[PDB]
RNA sequence: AGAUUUGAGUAUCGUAAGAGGACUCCCUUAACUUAAGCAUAUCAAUAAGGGAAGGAAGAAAAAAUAACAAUGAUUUCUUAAGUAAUGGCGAAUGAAAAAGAAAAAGACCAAGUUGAUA
RNA sequence: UGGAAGUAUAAAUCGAAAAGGUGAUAGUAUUCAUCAAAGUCUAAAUAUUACAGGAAAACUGAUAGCAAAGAAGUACUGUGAA
RNA sequence: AAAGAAUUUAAAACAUAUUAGAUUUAUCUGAUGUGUGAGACGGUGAUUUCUAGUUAAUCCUUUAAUAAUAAGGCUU
């Protein structure tokens, strides 16, 4: 084997021994310990999005980017100025890449905002936010009554068919298509009726006085990916005759044929 | 030191002066000017290849073989023939995989209680061997701090809830404790011999099936 | 089902999403240009390039704008500007 | 405004108006000493872009530098080097003329801080700049939150360490990307990091 | 382990295992791969014949993430999901549920055809397929999907 | 005589100088050595010369990667990797995006606007 | 410089914009993707064999370990750097 | 000529026609519908294979896609 050793240059002055590694681990661990002590949401490692990886080699694995785009904070009904101060990162630079990435992150904020519990800006019980809460209980109670009423009359149908298919799946794993076919028709009608609708520009910050339960970070309570189990499908007659290779050799050959089209039409 | 021995500016005198060709110091007027220089064989010169601090001090080992050696040092501590041959006085102990009730451990807070413990289960015939056979080290070890060279005694492998009893056993001569999770070959097999006298506890003994698993 | 990995139409079926903002000048820039053009005039290379265009040597005005600016797309943009001032007199 | 016409005018440096205006200034600065403070800047659109503001503590200094390359400083053009390093002429400095002139003003007026500098004119023999200096200890500089960062200790001799806009380019800090791989975070601080032979503690 | 070397057994030998007629002088033919075409040609000819020369075009900035395509043969497709799941669905047919061996999740993109698949219908979902892989899957009574 | 501009002296209140340079940001066109000679090349941002600072310094908010189921300031570590490339294609010199971690913070001038203008 | 019909810096000549740069095989054209240079600041993760205060050691133990375990950069040599 | 449902509810480019405020020059700035770009049906069909006719291209690459010059590859 022909040697390739880059020691001809000076190397004894280009060495870096790692003797501080046992003590670096201690030094950083005694910073987080002394950082959560100061204010615990300091080390909370403010929430990050759920973005895919670049390149086709890892284009199926999710990972935490940095900062939610301006489009996600508006879709999740969050103020962009306030979001930075409640342990949510913001990345105005990043541009939205897909409507699926817009919904996937918008749920990430909504779930977190329901878990979030903000203490009053002033500890004293005479704070205006706490005062305004008791001054608007009468209006809040009426709003919750009408929201609850019309959230149940609209889902009066989606509930029963989703109940049927969920219950009908128990028999088949101890007919089913009839319950699934009926559910599909109901959800189509619901989608059309919504389009055939202004809402709150912002939601409300959850502000309350509670016990101080301190959690070192927020990305580990909202999992990136739901657990994946074995996926099984119905083996029909259509999938038994799908010429997969013939499709690959057709899409590739079309790409190589865009050269002939331009050459032909240029003469 | 990197610059130890090579701090001079000596250039070899050369042939034609009836002296060897080893480098010689320049200048004059001192007993050192004109003497031998850098060469490894001279006096006040750098040695053979000087020891550099970036050598390989620590060594690596595969995990699945590091845990293989622990399961073979625990397994040999249940054989009284091996344990006795290692220098342990297990003549009077009731059972060589000795256990003690976790309730008895929970009341231990003073060393006179842990000493009474070691006597009750007849484990003090070994601790007294460490006390009665403590002598000084031989050679240059004493110049550097290491003076007393004791022997080995029983190992009290405690558990998760026996933490407050550590401060009791920790001053008896030749009684070293180690948590059940932190077991290693450096504990169960010191000096490469095998069969260390282990005094378990109920909490640690009943965990060994979860930590180590079984053969199936 | 899950798109194809080759060809022009390639990739997982998703709904991709950006404005192509045009970095242009305002309407008053047509005034700031003539204010300074009137005060300053033309360069030693813009005046000779005007001679070629008056005699109809349109191509040699480009090969003289490229020699003094070093970019083909910045020679056309300057030849047009020069010839748009010839028709303004 | 009145400054979006001056900026657009100053871009026509080949106009007959400017070429005459710069001809007088290049005559004036030839006979005046090499570095000498001028009362107010002569390119105020460029002066106020680089940081100058007409407040106390800010001063403007003019520096004249002799342009053109120079021979390698070896006696009689004799170099005991291999033919690879035997040239004398045609050896171009890395640091620009701007950085070189900036470092001269900083040394002469050592009590102040160089903020930036710009170009004024040139002739066949010289090239004249104008350096915008700041007096850190002035009470107006200290009490302005947007400019008191120049009173920090690390800004001493800002230009001899290569921190100004003109001297940073000579270090390669113009843009970003894969065209600037070797100057990612410093020309030499990057080189030492790549050439390091990392010896871990538990190494194979 | 410097007591195991050859120096500890070669004490008392004057030459120290390096010969008297030819001593242990510093260099024995240059430093490194010197003399590749002059006096070590009998080495780079006997042991590395194609070392000297040029072959193939130059890729100025190769992108190694676009040549990445792991492959799994058909015989190893059923081992992705397991041997218990294979036996569970061993009597399935057309119309009833069969497992989908999503190869892309496990890190295998291409699916090649080598060896024999068990005689059970199966669904295979992967980015690229080989011509003889599709026949082997279909002849057993299965399906060949595509992803991304 | 008066209103300005520019250039000086004197006085008051302050400022740079020198020490140190282990680590940090740089200016300079060394050679021994390797190529079994040697002249491009390697030694080599290496030795010497020179300038400047701090407790750390340097970089920092895209005229950036990418061709994606897209990412998103800077720095540092693992991996890519002795790989793509360069080279009397000889000796030899040799990165970066992707991916995994530590830490995470963004703001300002000029230009533009408001002028019983400050 | 790995950057190869030029990756970066500088010098001589030339030198723009009803903007434009990049997509590393020079060229022109039409699309497409991503950014919007030519001013400035910004703690944290990082480095260290100046120096000072400490703790350790499978390190040396007076020809060893710094050159120096004592009034050691001391006695002594040179005009001088040393 | 023969087999073939195709996967499912939060949206930005503005190509377009109409208005409101301005400009005169290589003219702009706003806002409201529309389709574009749209995907949730054995029988229909998106789609792919086969048989011959016609046209076009045809050794590989310049790494977002093509083109004609240029350059680089393989064999001799």
From Swiss-Prot, chain E:
Key words, A-Z: Cytoplasm, Endoplasmic reticulum, Ribonucleoprotein, Ribosomal protein
Keyword Cell inner membrane: no
InterPro entries registered for this protein in UniProt: Ribosomal_uL15 (IPR030878), Ribosomal_uL15/eL18 (IPR021131), Ribosomal_uL15/eL18_sf (IPR036227), Ribosomal_uL15_CS (IPR001196)
Signal sequence segment: none
Main location: cytoplasm
Organism domain of life: Eukaryota
Compartmental location: Cytoplasm, Cytosol; Cytoplasm; Endoplasmic reticulum
PROSITE patterns to which the protein is assigned, alphabetical: RIBOSOMAL_L15
Biological-process GO terms, alphabetical: translation
Region listing for Disordered, in residue ranges: 20-39
Keyword Cytoplasm among record annotations: yes
Cellular component terms per the entry's GO annotation: cytosolic large ribosomal subunit; endoplasmic reticulum
One GO MF term attached to the UniProt entry: structural constituent of ribosome
UniProt-listed SUPFAM superfamilies: Ribosomal proteins L15p and L18e (SSF52080)
Family statement: Belongs to the universal ribosomal protein uL15 family.
Subunit relationships: Component of the large ribosomal subunit.
Function recorded in the entry: Component of the large ribosomal subunit. The ribosome is a large ribonucleoprotein complex responsible for the synthesis of proteins in the cell.
Name of the protein in question: Large ribosomal subunit protein uL15A
Source organism: Entamoeba histolytica (strain ATCC 30459 / HM-1:IMSS / ABRM)
């Amino acid at each position: 084997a022909v040697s390739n050793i880059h020691f001809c240059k000076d190397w004894r002055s280009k060495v870096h021994t790692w003797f501080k590694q046992p003590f670096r681990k201690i030094r950083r661990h005694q910073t987080r310990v002394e950082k959560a002590k100061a204010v615990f949401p300091a080390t909370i490692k403010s929430l990050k999005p759920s973005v895919h990886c670049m390149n086709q080699r890892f284009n199926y694995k999710l990972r935490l980017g940095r900062g939610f785009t301006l489009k996600e904070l508006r879709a999740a009904k969050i103020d962009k100025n306030l979001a930075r101060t409640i342990g949510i990162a913001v990345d105005p630079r990043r541009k939205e890449s897909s409507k699926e990435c817009l919904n996937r992150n918008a749920q990430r904020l909504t779930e977190y905002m329901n878990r979030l519990v903000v203490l009053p800006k002033v500890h004293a019980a005479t704070a205006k936010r706490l005062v305004l809460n008791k001054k608007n209980a009468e209006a809040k109670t009426k709003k919750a009554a009408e929201i609850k009423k019309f959230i149940a009359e609209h889902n009066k149908t989606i509930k029963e068919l989703k109940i049927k298919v969920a219950a009908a799946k128990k028999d088949y794993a101890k007919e089913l298509k009839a319950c699934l076919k009926g559910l599909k028709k109901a959800q189509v009608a619901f989608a059309a009726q919504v389009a055939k609708k202004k809402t709150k520009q912002f939601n409300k910050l959850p502000v309350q006085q509670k016990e101080a339960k301190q959690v070192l970070d927020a990305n580990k309570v909202i999992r990136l990916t739901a657990p994946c189990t074995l996926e099984t499908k119905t083996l029909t007659k259509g999938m038994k005759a799908f010429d997969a290779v013939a499709h690959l050799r057709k899409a590739k050959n079309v790409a190589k044929a865009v050269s002939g089209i331009v050459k032909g039409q240029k003469k | 030191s990197t610059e130890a021995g090579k701090q001079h500016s000596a250039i070899s005198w050369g042939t034609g002066r009836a002296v060897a060709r080893i480098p010689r110091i320049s200048g004059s007027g001192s007993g050192r000017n004109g003497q031998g220089a850098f060469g490894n064989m001279t006096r006040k010169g750098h040695m053979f290849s000087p020891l550099k601090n970036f050598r390989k001090w620590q060594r690596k080992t595969p995990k699945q073989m590091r845990r293989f050696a622990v399961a073979s040092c625990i397994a040999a501590s249940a054989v009284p023939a091996l344990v006795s041959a290692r220098g342990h006085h297990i003549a009077g102990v009731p059972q060589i995989p000795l256990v003690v009730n976790s309730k008895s451990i929970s009341v231990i807070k003073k060393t006179k209680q842990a000493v009474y413990l070691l006597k009750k289960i007849n484990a003090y015939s070994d601790v007294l061997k460490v006390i009665a056979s403590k002598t000084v080290r031989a050679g240059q070890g004493k110049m550097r701090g290491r003076k007393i060279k004791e022997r080995k005694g029983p190992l009290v492998v405690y558990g998760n809830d026996d933490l407050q009893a550590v401060k009791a056993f920790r001053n008896i001569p030749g009684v070293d404790t180690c948590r059940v999770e932190n077991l290693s070959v450096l504990n169960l097999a010191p000096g490469c011999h095998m069969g260390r006298f282990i005094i378990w506890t109920e909490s640690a003994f009943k965990k060994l099936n979860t930590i180590f698993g079984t053969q199936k | 089902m899950a798109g194809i990995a080759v060809g022009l139409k390639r990739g997982y079926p998703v709904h991709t999403m950006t404005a192509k903002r045009h970095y242009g000048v305002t309407k008053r820039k047509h005034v700031v240009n003539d204010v300074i053009r009137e005060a300053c005039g033309f360069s030693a290379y813009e005046r000779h390039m005007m001679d070629l265009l008056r005699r109809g040597l349109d191509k040699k005005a480009l090969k003289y704008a490229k020699k003094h600016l070093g970019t083909h797309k910045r020679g056309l943009a300057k030849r047009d500007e020069i010839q748009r001032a010839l028709e303004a007199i | 405004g009145a400054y979006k016409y001056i900026n657009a005018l100053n871009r026509k440096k080949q106009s007959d108006v400017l070429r005459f205006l710069r001809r007088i200034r290049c005559w004036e600065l030839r006979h005046l000493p090499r570095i000498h403070r001028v009362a107010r800047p002569t390119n105020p659109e460029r002066a106020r872009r680089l940081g100058y503001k007409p407040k106390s503590g800010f001063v403007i200094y003019s520096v004249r530098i002799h342009r053109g390359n120079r021979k390698v400083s070896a006696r009689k053009g004799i170099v005991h080097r291999k033919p690879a390093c035997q040239g004398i002429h045609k050896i171009k400095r890395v640091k620009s003329l701007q950085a070189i002139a900036e470092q001269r003003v900083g040394k002469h007026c050592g009590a102040l801080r160089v903020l930036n500098s710009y170009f004024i004119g040139q002739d066949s023999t010289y090239r004249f700049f104008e350096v915008i200096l700041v007096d850190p200890f002035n009470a107006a500089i200290r009490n302005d939150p947007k400019m008191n960062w120049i009173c920090a200790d690390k800004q001493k001799r800002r230009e001899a360490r290569g921190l100004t806009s003109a001297a940073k380019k000579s270090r390669g800090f113009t843009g970003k990307g894969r065209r600037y791989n070797k100057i990612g975070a410093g020309a030499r601080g990057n080189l030492k990091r790549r050439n390091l032979l990392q010896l871990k503690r538990y190494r194979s | 382990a410097t007591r195991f070397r050859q120096t500890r057994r070669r004490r008392g030998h004057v030459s120290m295992g390096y010969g008297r007629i030819g001593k242990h002088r510093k260099q024995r033919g240059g430093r490194g791969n010197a003399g590749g075409q002059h006096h070590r040609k009998t080495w780079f000819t006997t042991f590395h014949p194609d070392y000297f020369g040029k072959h193939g075009m130059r890729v100025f900035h190769l992108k190694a993430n676009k040549y990445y395509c792991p492959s799994i043969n058909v015989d190893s497709l059923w081992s992705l999901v397991g041997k218990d799941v294979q036996a569970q669905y061993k009597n399935a047919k057309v119309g009833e549920e069969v497992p989908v061996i999503d190869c892309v999740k496990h890190g295998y993109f291409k699916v090649l055809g080598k060896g024999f698949l068990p005689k059970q219908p199966v669904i295979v979902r992967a980015r690229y397929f080989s011509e003889k892989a599709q026949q082997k899957i279909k002849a057993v009574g299965g399906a060949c999907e595509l992803t991304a």
